[PDB]
Amino acid sequence: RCKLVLVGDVQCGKTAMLQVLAKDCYPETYVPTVFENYTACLEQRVELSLWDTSGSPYYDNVRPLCYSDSDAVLLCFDISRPETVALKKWRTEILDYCPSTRVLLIGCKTDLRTDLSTLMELSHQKQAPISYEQGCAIAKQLGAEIYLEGSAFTSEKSIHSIFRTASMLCL
């Protein structure tokens, strides 16, 4: 039995993963979260209690309540948004509320590395999507155990992979 909490900027992809992971369903339309609990099972069999949270400052006062007795925190970001790489706020929040718990860095929307319109918009700001090895470096620099990434839209398999590794780490 493991309790995981997902945090990170609004629209970064946290609920999309949990829904794919636990509900067999990709939510293509953005509906902002307040707080929610999913239950998944990943083969020892491990029962995951997964706590989804708002990435909004508006809910800064309730989201920290989700950290209590957690096994790990999944600090999430959007790979197509090298501005969601705020992970500064996020890591300081996790440390202030939750200093005993380990931290995993999770990159989301990896499918967008080959999305032309994303690449065109990024390149007009002289930017590029976060790469895998950049994600490994950021993990190290934020003092996270490991970097993991997937795409909830194009690879359910990758999302299952993220959580099976998170499971192994909390146990």
Partner: protein
């Protein structure tokens, strides 16, 4: 500040989900204790006071979504601090919305 109506439940323990409770009108500037008290005045309307539970033995739980559940309290790790002073947590602090289910659970 602003008025809210909560779906107030008595619950056996902290946990996931909601059920039909009683509408309870509160203010968003009410502390978690004041809202608990207001909820109990409704959940035990007509019942003599020596037959009601001591409110100090009950926690307030905000149930949100399908299975989200969090204990709210007048003071916790989220409370505002300035010097030696702390602000008591209100419904507005947590952003509990109108129509929210709030359960009273054994403490």
């Amino acid at each position: 500040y602003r008025p809210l109506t909560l779906n107030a439940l008595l619950a056996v323990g902290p946990g996931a989900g909601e059920a039909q409770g009683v509408p309870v009108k509160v203010l968003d500037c009410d502390t978690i204790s004041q809202a608990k008290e207001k909820m109990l005045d409704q959940l035990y309307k007509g019942v003599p006071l020596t037959q009601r539970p001591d409110p100090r033995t009950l926690d307030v739980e905000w149930r949100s979504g399908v299975a989200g559940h969090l204990i709210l309290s007048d003071e916790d790790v989220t409370s505002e601090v300035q010097g030696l002073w702390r602000r008591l947590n209100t419904l507005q602090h947590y952003k509990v919305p109108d129509g929210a289910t709030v359960a009273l659970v054994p403490c």
